[PDB]
């Protein structure tokens, strides 16, 4: 091997391009050639008493690598669980790959966790996906529950936009011992196929690796069958460990090895492709996550021009941050700027209007927040020609808070159309918008509107927050006003008591819009976690809408505002 030698990280981009070329022909040929080249046995999985313990009859545990439980006296088959030890990079049996527990195997699952001295569970699935059960809930809603011989107590839950973290205490009956186990549940794998970008998964993996302790047993990894998504987690983790001392990758070799340990590991070509995509992105990024106590020092470092270099660390970091419906000729007039378009997968689709066509289109994108998916809509400043679409977007998407980050005119040019009424009520197609109040605060204006669907008479209140103190050139000297603004907007979402997204726009809906969303997320994360990763926040945003946080100065301001917020 020979045929499939290791890939130096320098050659990873070219290798992955080679594989992906001609509709992934070489990827398919490589993937299909994977063969451990030995005969296994699976007698335990197939025992009549064990068949009901297998979520999928066709996904079994090889005898030589299966995880063996201590038998329960008088109970045949009680040593069995559908789980296998799986190797990492220079880490033997580093993981246990297992299926999503069934109700009948909850006790078995927790007994495995106990007996194997595991501290970490990685769950690579939601419980239900597209109305199909992928895994049954093997953990308590709250407090303690008994699963066979093991008492499991939920101590804490953190629920975020793309993952949950649950902390448990374990106690075996008649034991002195108490053990802590953390479950990391990734919730952002799509219903069909693989993730479009690796960014959410890599953030998840980073979380797992921080909170998995030293002197612990294998990390328990599961999805539904415990082979596909479980396989991807394991090979990505292993290869990222490999690169630390070695700076080469061997995905082919590692999957081949894993296939001698559990059937089907990395179950599809698209999963095999996703692994390469994740590793490519991972090597292009570094570590940009910093605890609150080192933020000032990190900023100080970024502010320096290093010997050899001609720009600051802050500028280098920013530089590293390097569709169809928006392109339709009937929609081109609906874009403020031809180079700023929403991605197809995250675009805000409108209800089509019978005789129109293209009426499903608005230049706007769904953007996840810290706690919830689709927390924001990032959109351009409305044109006269898209104003009716804008109001309809708010209604259909239950957005009743609008954040405007530009003056109507800056530098003697029009930045946004005045899409709202002031002197009297106006009808925008289906919607009657009545102006109710206008509050002029030092750094912003708050406008309040009653909006009525003239089709059925249903009515809503919309609040618009227009920040007026962003300098027409550059960025605010102090983050104080903007941090207060973010706070005001979000207290309104709470008040309130908003469920739908906050719609955010500037002119093109990427620059200041990117800053508003980055800081909304970052400042809350700092308050609740005491860490900051500006770079990965912006990277994430750019998987949902292009160009988010448009300039180096906008990027630096995120750090500045984060620093000031900490000072408070």
Curated annotation (Swiss-Prot):
The active site is at residues 223, 506. It comes from the Eukaryota. Detected in peripheral blood plasmacytoid dendritic cells (at protein level). Detected in all tissues tested except for placenta and liver. Detected in peripheral blood plasmacytoid dendritic cells. The lineage of its organism: Eukaryota, Metazoa, Chordata, Craniata, Vertebrata. The chain holds residues 1367 to 1942 of 1948 of the full protein. Substrate binds at residues 191, 223-229, 267. Belongs to the protein-tyrosine phosphatase family. Receptor class 2A subfamily. Binding to large heparan sulfate proteoglycan structures promotes oligomerization. Binding to chondroitin sulfate proteoglycan does not lead to oligomerization. Interacts (via Ig-like domains) with NTRK3. Interacts (via Ig-like domains) with NTRK1, but does not form detectable complexes with NTRK2. Interacts with PPFIA1, PPFIA2 and PPFIA3. This is Receptor-type tyrosine-protein phosphatase S. Residues 1-568 are cytoplasmic. Cell surface receptor that binds to glycosaminoglycans, including chondroitin sulfate proteoglycans and heparan sulfate proteoglycan. Binding to chondroitin sulfate and heparan sulfate proteoglycans has opposite effects on PTPRS oligomerization and regulation of neurite outgrowth. Contributes to the inhibition of neurite and axonal outgrowth by chondroitin sulfate proteoglycans, also after nerve transection. Plays a role in stimulating neurite outgrowth in response to the heparan sulfate proteoglycan GPC2. It is found in: Cell membrane; Cell projection, Axon; Perikaryon; Cytoplasmic vesicle, Secretory vesicle, Synaptic vesicle membrane. A cleavage occurs, separating the extracellular domain from the transmembrane segment. This process called 'ectodomain shedding' is thought to be involved in receptor desensitization, signal transduction and/or membrane localization. Residues 27-282, 314-565 form the Tyrosine-protein phosphatase domain.
């Amino acid at each position: 091997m020979l045929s499939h030698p290791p890939i130096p990280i320098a050659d990873m981009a070219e290798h992955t391009e080679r594989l992906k070329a001609n509709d992934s022909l070489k990827l398919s040929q490589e993937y299909e050639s994977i063969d451990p080249g030995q005969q296994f046995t699976w007698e335990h999985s197939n025992l009549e008493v064990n068949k009901p313990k297998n979520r999928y009859a066709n996904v079994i545990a090889y005898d030589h690598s299966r995880v063996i439980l201590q038998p329960i006296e008088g109970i045949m088959g009680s040593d069995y669980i559908n789980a296998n030890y799986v190797d990492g990079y220079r880490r033997q049996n580093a993981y246990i790959a297992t299926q999503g527990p069934l109700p009948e195997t909850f006790g078995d699952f927790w007994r495995m966790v106990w007996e194997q001295r595991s501290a970490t569970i990685v769950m690579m699935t939601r419980l239900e996906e597209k109305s199909r059960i992928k895994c049954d809930q093997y953990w308590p809603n709250r407090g303690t529950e008994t699963y066979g011989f093991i008492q499991v107590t939920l101590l804490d839950t953190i629920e975020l936009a793309t993952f949950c973290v649950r902390t448990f205490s374990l106690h075996k009956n008649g034991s002195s011992e108490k053990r802590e186990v953390r479950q990391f549940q990734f919730t952002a794998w799509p219903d069909h196929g693989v993730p479009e970008y690796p960014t959410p998964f890599l953030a998840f993996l980073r979380r797992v690796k921080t909170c998995n302790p030293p002197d612990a047993g294998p990390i328990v990894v599961h999805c539904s069958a415990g082979v596909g998504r479980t396989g991807c987690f394991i090979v990505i983790d292993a290869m990222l460990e490999r690169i630390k001392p070695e700076k080469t990758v061997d995905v082919y070799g590692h999957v081949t090895l894993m296939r001698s340990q559990r059937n089907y590991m990395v179950q599809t070509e698209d999963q095999y492709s996703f692994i390469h995509e994740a590793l490519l992105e991972a090597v292009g990024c570094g570590n940009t996550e910093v605890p609150a106590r080192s933020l000032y020092a990190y900023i100080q470092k970024l502010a320096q021009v290093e010997p050899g270099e001609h720009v600051t660390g802050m500028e280098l970091e920013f530089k590293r941050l390097a569709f169809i419906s928006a392109n339709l000729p009937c929609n081109k007039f609906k874009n403020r700027l031809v180079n700023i378009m929403p991605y197809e997968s995250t675009r805000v689709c409108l209800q089509p209007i019978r005789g129109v066509e293209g009426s499903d289109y608005i230049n706007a994108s769904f953007i996840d927040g810290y706690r919830q998916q689709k927390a924001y809509i990032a959109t351009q400043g409305p044109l006269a020609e898209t104003t009716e679409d804008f109001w309809r977007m708010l209604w259909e998407n239950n957005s009743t808070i609008v954040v405007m980050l530009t003056k109507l005119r800056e530098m003697g040019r029009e930045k946004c159309h005045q899409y709202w009424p002031a002197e009297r009520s106006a009808r925008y197609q289906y919607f009657v918008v009545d102006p109710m109040a206008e509050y002029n605060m030092p750094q912003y204006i708050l406008r309040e509107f009653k909006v009525t669907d003239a089709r059925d008479g249903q009515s809503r209140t919309v609040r618009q927050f227009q920040f007026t103190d962003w300098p027409e050139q550059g960025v605010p000297k102090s983050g104080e006003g903007f941090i207060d603004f973010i706070g005001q907007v979000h207290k309104t979402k709470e008040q309130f008591g908003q469920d739908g997204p906050i719609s955010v726009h500037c002119s093109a809906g990427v620059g200041r819009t990117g800053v508003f969303i980055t800081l909304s997320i970052v400042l809350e994360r700092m308050r609740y976690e005491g860490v900051v990763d500006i770079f990965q926040t912006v990277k994430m945003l750019r998987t949902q809408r292009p160009a988010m946080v448009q300039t180096e100065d906008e990027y630096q301001f995120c750090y500045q505002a984060a620093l000031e917020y900490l000072g408070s």
